[PDB]
Design an enzyme around this catalytic site. Sequence first.
Site, PDB file in Angstrom:
ATOM      1  N   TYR A   1     -13.029  -2.295  -1.988  1.00 51.80           N
ATOM      2  CA  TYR A   1     -13.764  -1.340  -1.590  1.00 51.80           C
ATOM      3  C   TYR A   1     -15.429  -0.836  -2.640  1.00 51.80           C
ATOM      4  O   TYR A   1     -14.910  -1.124  -3.385  1.00 51.80           O
ATOM      5  CB  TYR A   1     -12.557  -0.387  -1.476  1.00 51.80           C
ATOM      6  CG  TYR A   1     -11.591  -0.446  -0.449  1.00 51.80           C
ATOM      7  CD1 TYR A   1     -11.765  -1.194   0.432  1.00 51.80           C
ATOM      8  CD2 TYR A   1     -10.583   0.667  -0.397  1.00 51.80           C
ATOM      9  CE1 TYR A   1     -10.265  -1.905   1.238  1.00 51.80           C
ATOM     10  CE2 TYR A   1      -9.266   0.264   0.969  1.00 51.80           C
ATOM     11  CZ  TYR A   1      -9.457  -0.415   1.380  1.00 51.80           C
ATOM     12  OH  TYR A   1      -9.111  -0.266   2.719  1.00 51.80           O
TER      13      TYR A   1
ATOM     14  N   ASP B   1       0.351  -0.868  -0.100  1.00 49.11           N
ATOM     15  CA  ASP B   1      -0.009  -0.198   0.008  1.00 49.11           C
ATOM     16  C   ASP B   1       0.761   1.319  -0.436  1.00 49.11           C
ATOM     17  O   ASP B   1       0.451   2.153  -0.705  1.00 49.11           O
ATOM     18  CB  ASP B   1      -0.899   0.104   1.334  1.00 49.11           C
ATOM     19  CG  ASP B   1      -1.998  -1.449   1.535  1.00 49.11           C
ATOM     20  OD1 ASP B   1      -2.503  -1.541   0.247  1.00 49.11           O
ATOM     21  OD2 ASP B   1      -1.912  -0.913   2.985  1.00 49.11           O
TER      22      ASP B   1
END
Lengths: 390, 390, 390, 390
Positions: free
Chosen positions: C333, C73
């Site tokens: 998401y 990330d």
Amino acid sequence: EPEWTYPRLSCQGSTFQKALLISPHRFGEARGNSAPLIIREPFIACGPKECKHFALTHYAAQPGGYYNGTREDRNKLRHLISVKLGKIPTVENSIFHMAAWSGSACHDGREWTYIGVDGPDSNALIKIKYGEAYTDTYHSYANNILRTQESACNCIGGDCYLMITDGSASGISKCRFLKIREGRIIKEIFPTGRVEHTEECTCGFASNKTIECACRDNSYTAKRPFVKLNVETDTAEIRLMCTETYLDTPRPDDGSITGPCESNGDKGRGGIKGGFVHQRMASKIGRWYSRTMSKTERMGMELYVRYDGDPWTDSDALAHSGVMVSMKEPGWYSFGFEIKDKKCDVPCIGIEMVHDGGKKTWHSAATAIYCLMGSGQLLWDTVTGVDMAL
Amino acid sequence: EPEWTYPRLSCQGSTFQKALLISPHRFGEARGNSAPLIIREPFIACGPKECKHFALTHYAAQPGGYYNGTREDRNKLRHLISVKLGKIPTVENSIFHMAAWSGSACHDGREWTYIGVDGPDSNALIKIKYGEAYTDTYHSYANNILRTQESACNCIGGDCYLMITDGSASGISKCRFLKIREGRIIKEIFPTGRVEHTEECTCGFASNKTIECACRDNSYTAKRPFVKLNVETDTAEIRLMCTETYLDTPRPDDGSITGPCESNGDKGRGGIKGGFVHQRMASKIGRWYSRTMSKTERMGMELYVRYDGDPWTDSDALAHSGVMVSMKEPGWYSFGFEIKDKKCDVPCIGIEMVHDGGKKTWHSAATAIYCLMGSGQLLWDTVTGVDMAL
Amino acid sequence: EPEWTYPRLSCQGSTFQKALLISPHRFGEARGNSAPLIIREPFIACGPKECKHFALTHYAAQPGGYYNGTREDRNKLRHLISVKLGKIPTVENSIFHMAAWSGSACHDGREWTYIGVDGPDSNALIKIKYGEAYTDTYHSYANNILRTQESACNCIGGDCYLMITDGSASGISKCRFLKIREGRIIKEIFPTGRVEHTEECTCGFASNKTIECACRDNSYTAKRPFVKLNVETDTAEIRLMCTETYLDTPRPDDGSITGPCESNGDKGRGGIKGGFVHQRMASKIGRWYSRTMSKTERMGMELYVRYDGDPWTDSDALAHSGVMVSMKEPGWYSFGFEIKDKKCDVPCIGIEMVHDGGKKTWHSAATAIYCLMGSGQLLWDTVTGVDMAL
Amino acid sequence: EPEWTYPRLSCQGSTFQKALLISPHRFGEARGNSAPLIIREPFIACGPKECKHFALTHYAAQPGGYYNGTREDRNKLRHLISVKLGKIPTVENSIFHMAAWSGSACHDGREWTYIGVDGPDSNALIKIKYGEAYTDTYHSYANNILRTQESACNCIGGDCYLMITDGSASGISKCRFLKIREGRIIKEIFPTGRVEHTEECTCGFASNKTIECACRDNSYTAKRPFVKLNVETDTAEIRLMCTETYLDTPRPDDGSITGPCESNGDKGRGGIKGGFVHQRMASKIGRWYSRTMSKTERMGMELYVRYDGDPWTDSDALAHSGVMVSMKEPGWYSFGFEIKDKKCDVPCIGIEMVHDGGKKTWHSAATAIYCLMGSGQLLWDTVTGVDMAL
Ligand SMILES: *[C@@H]1O[C@H](CO)[C@@H](O)[C@H](O)[C@H]1NC(C)=O
Ligand SMILES: *[C@@H]1O[C@H](CO)[C@@H](O)[C@H](O)[C@H]1NC(C)=O
Ligand SMILES: *[C@@H]1O[C@H](CO)[C@@H](O)[C@H](O)[C@H]1NC(C)=O
Ligand SMILES: *[C@@H]1O[C@H](CO)[C@@H](O)[C@H](O)[C@H]1NC(C)=O
Ligand SMILES: [Ca+2]
Ligand SMILES: [Ca+2]
Ligand SMILES: [Ca+2]
Ligand SMILES: [Ca+2]
Ligand SMILES: [Ca+2]
């Protein structure tokens, strides 16, 4: 609405200088990732805010698989395309305007007129487009490859003039001029004078009353037919240029053609479209011309100027003003065009530099541009930088 | 703010000519560097300043790895895409508007309305987008592949009209018209007359009072259902075209269907979407139509015209006006559209040219355009130039 | 100047429907010619005329050679990029706004505010950009990965609100809201209530006085923290959602968490950013939410609605409104956003569908969008159509 | 029509932060599908609404076949190109402005002025373009590589100021300033003071009355020539920076050059273009500078600041403000530029990060940007992430 375009005085300057090379095939390597279109007969035309770079594509890219036939001139797939000047003409950057194997285009101050010819050899057709709309056509009058300029048409007060011609490439091709307003032909103009073969005219404004064109005689002479078109009366007359600096290719040595100005001379068969652009000053007119450095091949390109006089009667040599392309590099069609600055017009010549490896591989072109800029003398030449084996 | 668009009189002209070929797969070679999208059912629609070229993509490019299934019509990945007319529909040039395996789009003078159908066969859905905003939907009424035009919808004064149909491809499909204003359905129109099967309507304005459509009957006949929709009362009636020049594919020989205009005749099963566009003159209406050269296969395409008369009652043969695509070249769906010149409208016909190598390879299409342009006869045909093995 | 944006009533409609798939990796085959960027954490934000699709790129394309590290990330190369919604986010189509491994953006009616966080884990930095200009920063207050929404911020009357948070991923992360006007932080808002862990808030307007957000608790519960921010007083309070339909992933079975509304419950550790968007009617408020179909994995995605009530106190199940992504497909998401139509706002949910083949190959995402559209029920699901081996 | 731009006060802030990395060769892998251009000497210049990212390309892309010679500075193919800041400079995204192996460009509030030098070494030429139009030129005065800034020129009230120099890289190069108005040189400014070698000036406005430049002396010193140009009298004076923190590369240890401010000291031979930008406050002026981390190689880059004082007489060490690029990463030319926020100007420094693998492979550069943003200390460095073997 925008107001119509008129020729203005040229911007100040006294020599041309190397401005820009657009060499799409610097990106066509088999190991690269680009798609430059295979093109020929490039030209540039400008409106008030931008210039477009036009060309006739064979509708194929490099690298690719359709190289066969790209040395031919006329087929069912050739299209007139443009990119904004300064962009590389690739499959994604280009706009396909229309199917055409001969073309022209010009901006009248409000919209683009695009012109393309296609159809069979014995029955071709001029097609005109105003913006997005197809607005008019003109038919073959001599049934033998009706064709047009391969450079910009010229608009004044909304009226746009275009040279067209039709006839044998090794015989008679009498040209005509069409007067076009908003995409529609409102007048045909039949020239007078030495008319037996005129094709590929490069035209521009000598003033608000006269369009002049330096053209190609593919049949009888190495001198260029030179049109003077009167815009107020819509009449044209043509005579051969009398200068001893013959501008065609092939051509004999300078000054070797004896007899009066209109004498045809030797090595007249064959030819090449030639650069010609005006520098309009308040009291003096400069005429700038280009010709290949080789007398017989499409190799090299040199600049010449002459101020004032009368092209039809002056036998004087033109003044050499610099080597734009060395003998070592291709110099094929050349053409003139003007960039509009805020208050004056900038004269330029562009040069088609064809990558020719014959009929067995792809055939396409770089475009080199020289423009009037500052003073002193022309300083550097243009190479395409392309290795055709990659 | 911008005026609502209305149909104007067509620009002067009396023949169609070859205008433009968009042939994206001229760049799809596995050794090239481009990404043309795999597409079918192209159509074009123009607003006042620009035309967009729409298609239904399989969300895959050539060269690539997703060729399997690209011959099928409906699946979860198909999307309605567009590029500005004149650009090649690649991965980077296209806009993905919405998920859709059947589509339509039109401009109303102020904004674009995009229509796409997706969902399962038994219960699909018309989804409408106005600009960027999803605005409305319409449900399946016969639960058997709700579907729309595959060509431009038509707007007058802000009201856009759209054919939809739902029903069996082998039986009854009664179509309906939707009246859409700023993306929302404000009226449903239930036609009268011969309504047992109407699909893939190509529609345009015959005047400010009437929309007409030439449609496909996939079960009963090779004569085309022809719709007259009165825009003032919002009513529509449908009857078969009576002309002996049957426009569908497959079809029997011209003139072999005996009986009144309404007899269905033979080889009614199957069909193709057909081109149709109006030339609106002050005193007369030309109706231009296209149909394949082959009576049974989707090969070739020819132009036909008829001025005035009533398409429902006139058995007269239509006048042949030129071969747009020869029999050696694919001629699949065709459609009409109109380009907006400054003061008049230009009618054109577009032709989908599918590269079909069966289900074992990619399946996609080129689009050829012919527009009303000048006088004389239609001069040249169109080839795609694409070799599917490359 | 343009006037400032405010939330308006939602456009009429009562069900969501499949709108658009943006699946860039349908074009990333080693044998194809495209360059889709490797991205994750996509979101969409709209201004009055267009929407932009944002994402955090690892600054690498497929096919390519930098797949190592694209499952991580945070690093030195991640950037916030956008394309116009509807374009494929490729190397050439994308704009690189700033270096950022967490982001947000929103339009206030006059200009875009872009927000990105980068810097070391223990010392990160919020950076704000108004148009082209870098205008302000905010420092880490808990020294443990300061981070922000991964979805649109929300502007009203020119004041834009943003959730930020900082703290342990398996411990306390108290969020803050920043009030930003023209790129500068004019106020910090410290919420009250159940504050021990709030991150990745998806926020929207419930009216002109209230912003509500459904957030993620990565540490203590599978219920979502639900923020109510009062825009007139600039105060926020947070409490857990009380519905028995737990929206986090992982989560226990619905209704299995005993005790009062604020009870943490079981399987609270771990989480996922969740979709939430408002449908504002004159008398009733719809809250639409998405959650994965699997209780423990990022697979599938289903829609739920509830009209009115109080999320903090109602224990009632939410009404299931359809399967957007089947169990078979990735559902990672999700986020809400509104498209501005001419007079009303259109609520949508987008879904990140990550192509995950683990740490050994590239890691990136498609984005699926569902929007409120018409009436009846949700009809079809989304597949990415990507085969990761190509 | 648009107002002429003037320098405003800088936006509030007290530290620089990492803003953006443009790293085109992250997409140049031979297995990828992109075409980043091979470039060196990047710089950025902004007008009121947009910044352009300029560079000098070798007219070649990676992957490709024209890598040989891409380490050399001057040849017939180099061109000045730009893309909008935030886009990757590929073959298709770039605009080719003019042939140039040294360049500069600035916006004056109404139009872009592009400056490029080409021609042979012994007799090169400054060519100026204003928008699309070639407008003026300036000749070589010392016949030894006439050359300009490699960064933005500076305009106030329509007058743009530009450093040029001509002379030996190992000896004397006296620079001159040109004052250009709408593309035409209206004044030549001959500096006074320590003028024996000044090249590659990075210039900006200290106020509406003074332009200052931090320049490179490639023969005599590691202290930078620092120019104060009074815009009202059009006069300029040059003296060495007195600070013990020498900004050139190579350099001796800080503070080792004893003697008055004007002593040249040691390791004066060689140099690098250095970053410099102003932060103009109501009462004080910050001067921000960058220099490599290494004293002798083009590795790393650190930020330094000094408020007020006189750069000509202050021997004080400059205040270290952060490592923008570590010593493991390349730090070659750097420049300052300013972004126009709504009411104030944002100072930034850009850093050219050359991927240099010697003359046997491609040679090109990434550009990293740091801008004044908030308060605190500079938090993170920049890496290019590029593996040259890919
Ligand atoms: C041409 O005519 C227009 C006025 O109609 C004038 O503005 C322009 O200067 C004239 N051009 C030249 C070269 O005289
Ligand atoms: C249709 O109506 C518009 C105005 O409503 C008019 O300007 C136009 O010419 C009319 N078109 C036709 C085909 O009569
Ligand atoms: C919000 O406030 C503006 C007026 O300031 C109004 O136009 C708008 O309708 C209000 N929005 C809603 C949902 O009430
Ligand atoms: C410079 O002058 C302009 C107007 O001429 C003014 O608005 C601006 O604030 C001045 N800038 C500085 C740095 O004082
Ligand atoms: Ca000849
Ligand atoms: Ca591209
Ligand atoms: Ca049929
Ligand atoms: Ca949790
Ligand atoms: Ca030095």
